[PDB]
């Protein structure tokens, strides 16, 4: 027998019979998975008969204990005791947890997807681990009573385990993880205070349904025990010098970055001007087949603008297209909590991939963070940490938080809370979505060993800067706009940030 | 809690929510049958989730103990332990019995329908009761692995509970039992030594799916603790006197029985000739729709004869019709273990209803008993007993056994073994299917107070007696037949048995 | 038996047997509706056998005569003669009018939907009443041979009734009327000379299909004999004074109204800036679900721009949305008579809800009127009264007609003809879609107590004034645009209407 503090939840394998490829057995795959790094195993039989169930639990319990890996059994507690399994794992509609413990003394997993559930797990006291929500969409779970909750929904849970100090309860992520997201799920599924993250990733069809369980399992292992998530080929690491702003503007000019705008029509003419003005080239393509090719172009950058007529399967593909190539996405959730359809949509978009920067104004940034002038600072930090990103917040003061944290993940440095991440301010006195376009361009020109945080900061300066200049040569809102673009053009051409009006301080 | 000795299996109610009539509830029904008959209650939930299960099992355990009746739980032993059930009932493909008892110490049931299963039950020594095979076909059990077994099947199981002598184990019959067959089932489901019969009848749909459980349970009860099954409207209760054979032949003549022949085309024209001899009326309808109107007609009799190219859907329809009217049925299994399709077919027919007589010869009688001359006696006895009927076996001698037993059933008198039942013999020195036709005519004309056993014997005599007479006036196979029909005519007209050739002894 | 002049058309209920809620009878509905407001019944049986039809017309003619209400029969006139009915309603495909009149002498209703039908109903002399076209789409008319016509088409018909002086003819409108459109139908369905209006509303599925005929009938009555259609939460009532254009430009700035533009691409970026310059906020949403939320936002306003790629179902949704909250809609039929598809689409939109302003040019406004300088005034005035709206005609001069008549409606003050309404004009000497956006913004800012008319005027002035000024400060097409926005910016900021170039006269 094992002990609670002996279980290793790193790569937890949940089983499925009707899914194994033709000519391969359940024993066949599960072995391949043990040999190559699976570290816990659940047997899951929703359909078979109590006798065959047992017959195969004994055949697989043997296989496991030979690799010194435990064996949990799904919702059939009796079967579990029957065969001396090492733990059972029940969901929300199964046997109450108190009753389960009154027939065993041994490890229990509870399927949680909501904070309220964690509350009750705690009004119980030392339930030993929990499967966290359905992170993504998956057709492995027949007739499901929840919904793809996202990494944000899984954070909301990790966070309730801290409010409750439920130190005793481990966690695993489950529901549609494959190598195209495992990294991002590990990377953002962390409590705000930074003290706790996931204890392990849990797959079913990525191994069970693989032609090559061996190969597939070695990959997941590889993602799982690595600690740097390099999501965009730019460095992620002390105020921004003028000479830094400089070479940033040099690189972006020397590189002619192609910036793909998926935005409405209004922001569209304007945006492509600002991009052009910065020595870059806009592309307003929202065509799905094309998305793979644009992103492949050198120094290519994507700009996202909630509610743009483009169908979500295409924003999904767009985002994905670019994280595949390690390239920068800037996200501008214009709408947000303004409406029903928009809250819902952004939250969906935010689960499609990793963003390099999210820009919004006081209302937008406050909504995203789930919460003045001090308060703004607070919420920007909150959002930058919560989506692991550079998060800009605009207004008279622009605040710029860096929550990427070098791009480090782990299974519980993680220790750097929300409130410790560096955040700056940019002021120029009293004077939109063209900010998006600016940042996008700045970031897009940066070379390998460049820097993401400085780049965004340069962008917010360059923009706020041009704002003053234009603000002073306008005759009205009409001419301000054409002057704003002009200023942006002249400003980046005379590369002398030392002569710029906007002052950059610490938040 | 209860004790194994206190469980009453009289009327055993098994549960099924997905079948309950609109407007009514499980509690609804399960209450009604508690007030009106049920004596034991099993919860069956093959679909619902482990929580909901427990919720409704607790809700019903209270409803039961409220009537001092127990509550068994189907296949889910943990749910039993959890809610403090009084027993669990598993299947052949559910948890092994060893493992179950290693979790509990409380009653266990076991669904059986094959002597080998009883053989193992026995090599375990004191498993507590068994649900006996599928008796009849039922669409309540979704996707089944057995096949309906009939009373013949149930017997073969009871018969292994004595061979292995498992005093300690009780039995209930299950599946397809309705009011149209509970009597017949109770009646012929007794062990071959008469000692052990069923201890309970077990229904699911006859109550649960009833637009009035209250009424339906009252009726089921009425049957189960009644003790006389009067299947034919004739008496059933010391050698046959010449005066008895005489008033038998008068009755059939003064009654002109209508004898419906469902038989092949070669015994067809013949048998009609015999029936006509005996002052009866042949009708040869293998029409389904007509069957019930034919049985209406006064003193109507039915004669079956395997392999008559009427659909079994008709033979079922037909047999049923005459038992609903308590009229007699002669059964002749011409074919039998001669081929395959025949054995199959006869066995299915034998499950359709209750026969007043089963005639056959040497090969047939021996096949039916599942087993010379002392041997035919022992075999005729077995057949008679087994199918609770008067059994004629033809040859040199004709042996006639009476295994009806006044129509008695019990839930374990029943103790009147095979060997004991009355068996006579009729000889007449060295002299076919017309016997059946004759037997049918003799039984047909008896009135409520007449006696089935005598009627048959008269038949065999009369016939055996036309035998001698025609053997004498024949010139070969052709005229022998025409003199046999002729003799039969003369013999019954000059009704004076005091003169006929054959000797009736005591086998 | 009633008289011709004793028929109360107010609320004319038509029958339908197949559409009645399980549990209620036809008697039930009709009765219910009788007590609560119905003033005429017509039986309608396109299916049932003439015996059963009749059993029902009597039963029902009784229930009607008890509440002193007449009963008409549809098209089966013999059935009317047969049961002593008060009138028959026939259609266009039914028995010629003369032939009916030759067999009865009684009241006769005719389903009309085009002027031609009126011309015929005219050169016949004293047909009693007509049922007017199909106003809105409906599935209660199985296999329809017409096409929904809208209140627009209904007016065409009401106008042939004057060109013909058919003073002997009543009208009722029929076809898909429910509480979300009775008011509007009652309000705009009036003769071009205003001398004639509708004599009642006819509903089928609203009462007959209601799960509460009682309540549905009370509501409909409530609306039919009210006299105020307050359709926009603004005033509706002597040249517009400088002080007023000034208090107007304040309300709009101080209230920053959210203006939703459903327009193409080319009026999008441009239109958004005009909105911006006016201190109000652009929303480019063509999202079908947001549209309810957008209109719940304060001082919110909608601008339609025919042909905008937005699906017609969305335009309906959107238009409905704003009327349900009483917020103003600005309609700009750019395309119009230009093509086929456009003319078609524009008329579909016009019958969707109630607009507060329709802007358009010489071409557009001449088209809408179904019809220089003395001419545009005559046409502008028409388009205002026909669609009960403040209607603007851009050109060298700009013409504004207020045809909303305090929002009054009747059953025939109605009498204030196309010519009578106020029409003012706006000159600035010899100097695009911006005007819509401007007017949308003036109207949007207006509070409970404002006045839709002045607001519209203000906008036109402000837009015209802006023109003279940019026409002065421009060096070409492009500069002109940007100078136009600026002038609106400046002009409104220094809210000083006394000093504007454009002169406001009576037209
Ligand atoms: C068995 C099970 N429970 C889930 C939950 O949502 O909590 S997901 C899941 C299976 C999904 O895994 P995959 O996509 O790797 O097959
Ligand atoms: C649950 C179950 N087991 C069976 C077996 O053949 O062992 S039959 C059966 C259900 C049959 O019930 P009814 O026909 O009365 O609805
Ligand atoms: C019988 C009949 N003729 C119509 C026409 O348009 O001429 S409409 C109509 C019935 C439709 O009523 P509702 O849509 O209010 O249920
Ligand atoms: C619904 C489930 C949720 N979580 C887990 C796991 F993490 F594997 F324990 N298994 C499940 N079957
Ligand atoms: C398959 C079954 C067989 N027998 C019984 C009973 F007899 F009631 F115990 N219940 C079952 N569900
Ligand atoms: C087709 C119809 C048109 N109009 C009317 C009425 F309500 F009488 F005006 N009834 C009809 N059945
Ligand atoms: Mg479960
Ligand atoms: Mg079972
Ligand atoms: Mg008609």
Automatic annotation (TrEMBL), chains A, B, C:
Cofactor section: Mg(2+)
Pathway participation: Cofactor biosynthesis; thiamine diphosphate biosynthesis; thiamine phosphate from 4-amino-2-methyl-5-diphosphomethylpyrimidine and 4-methyl-5-(2-phosphoethyl)-thiazole: step 1/1; Cofactor biosynthesis; thiamine diphosphate biosynthesis; 4-methyl-5-(2-phosphoethyl)-thiazole from 5-(2-hydroxyethyl)-4-methylthiazole: step 1/1
Catalyzed reactions per annotation: 2-(2-carboxy-4-methylthiazol-5-yl)ethyl phosphate + 4-amino-2-methyl-5-(diphosphooxymethyl)pyrimidine + 2 H(+) = thiamine phosphate + CO2 + diphosphate; 4-methyl-5-(2-phosphooxyethyl)-thiazole + 4-amino-2-methyl-5-(diphosphooxymethyl)pyrimidine + H(+) = thiamine phosphate + diphosphate; 5-(2-hydroxyethyl)-4-methylthiazole + ATP = 4-methyl-5-(2-phosphooxyethyl)-thiazole + ADP + H(+); 2-[(2R,5Z)-2-carboxy-4-methylthiazol-5(2H)-ylidene]ethyl phosphate + 4-amino-2-methyl-5-(diphosphooxymethyl)pyrimidine + 2 H(+) = thiamine phosphate + CO2 + diphosphate
GO MF, any single term: ATP binding
Cellular component terms (Gene Ontology): cytosol
InterPro entries: Aldolase_TIM (IPR013785), Hyethyz_kinase (IPR000417), Ribokinase-like (IPR029056), ThiamineP_synth_sf (IPR036206), ThiamineP_synth_TenI (IPR022998), TMP_synthase (IPR034291)
UniProt KW Secreted keyword: no
Binding residue positions for Mg(2+) 5: 332, 364
Residue numbers binding Mg(2+) 2: 50, 75, 94
Protein function: Condenses 4-methyl-5-(beta-hydroxyethyl)thiazole monophosphate (THZ-P) and 2-methyl-4-amino-5-hydroxymethyl pyrimidine pyrophosphate (HMP-PP) to form thiamine monophosphate (TMP).
The family this protein is said to belong to: In the N-terminal section; belongs to the thiamine-phosphate synthase family.
Protein name: Thiamine phosphate synthase/TenI domain-containing protein
Lineage, broadest ranks: Eukaryota, Fungi, Dikarya, Ascomycota, Saccharomycotina
Gene label: THI6
């Amino acid at each position: 027998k094992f002990s609670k503090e002996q279980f290793d939840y790193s790569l937890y394998l949940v089983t499925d019979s009707g899914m194994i490829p033709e000519g391969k057995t359940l024993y066949g795959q599960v072995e391949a998975g043990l040999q190559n790094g699976v570290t816990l195993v659940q047997i899951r039989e929703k359909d078979a008969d109590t006798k065959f169930f047992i017959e195969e639990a004994l055949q697989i319990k043997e296989l496991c204990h030979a690799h010194n890996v435990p064996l949990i059994i799904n919702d059939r507690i009796d079967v579990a005791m029957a065969i001396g399994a090492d733990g059972i794992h029940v969901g929300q509609d199964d046997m109450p947890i108190p009753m389960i413990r009154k027939l065993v003394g041994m490890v229990i997993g509870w399927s949680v997807g909501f904070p309220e559930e964690v509350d009750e797990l705690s009004k119980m006291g030392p339930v030993d681990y929990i499967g966290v929500g359905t992170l993504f969409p998956t057709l492995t779970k027949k007739n499901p009573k929840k919904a793809p909750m996202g990494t944000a929904g899984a954070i909301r849970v990790l966070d309730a385990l801290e409010r409750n100090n439920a130190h005793w309860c481990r966690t695993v992520g489950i529901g549609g993880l494959h190598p195209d997201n495992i990294e991002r799920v590990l990377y953002q599924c962390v409590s705000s205070n930074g003290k706790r993250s996931l204890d392990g990733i849990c797959v079913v069809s990525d191994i069970i349904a693989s032609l090559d369980a061996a190969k597939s399992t070695k990959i997941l292992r590889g993602l799982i025990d690595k600690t740097d998530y390099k999501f965009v080929n730019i460095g992620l690491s002390s105020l921004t010098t003028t000479d830094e702003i400089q070479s940033i503007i040099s690189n972006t000019l020397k590189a002619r970055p192609l910036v793909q705008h998926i935005t409405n029509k209004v922001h569209q003419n304007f945006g492509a001007n600002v991009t052009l003005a910065l020595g870059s080239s806009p592309i307003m393509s929202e065509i799905q087949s094309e998305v793979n090719d644009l992103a492949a172009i050198p120094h290519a950058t994507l700009l996202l603008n909630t509610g743009s007529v483009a169908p979500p399967e295409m924003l999904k593909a767009a985002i994905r297209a670019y994280n595949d190539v390690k390239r920068p996405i800037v996200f501008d959730p214009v709408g947000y909590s303004a409406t029903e359809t928009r809250l819902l949509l952004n939250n969906l978009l935010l689960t499609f991939g990793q963003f390099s920067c999210i820009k919004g104004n006081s209302s937008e940034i406050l909504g995203l963070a789930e919460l003045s002038n001090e308060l703004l600072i607070q919420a920007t930090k909150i959002v930058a940490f919560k989506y692991k990103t550079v998060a800009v917040c605009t207004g008279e003061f622009d605040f710029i938080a860096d929550g990427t944290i070098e791009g480090k993940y782990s299974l519980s440095t993680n220790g750097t809370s929300v409130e410790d991440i560096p955040c700056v301010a940019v002021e120029a006195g009293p004077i939109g979505c063209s900010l998006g376009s600016t940042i996008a361009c700045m970031i897009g020109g940066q070379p390998s060993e460049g820097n993401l945080f400085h780049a965004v900061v340069a962008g917010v300066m360059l923009y706020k800067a041009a704002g003053k200049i234009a603000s002073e040569k306008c005759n009205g809102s009409g001419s301000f706009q054409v002057e704003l673009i002009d200023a942006l053009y002249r400003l980046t051409r005379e590369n002398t940030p030392v002569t710029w009006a906007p002052k950059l301080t610490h938040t």
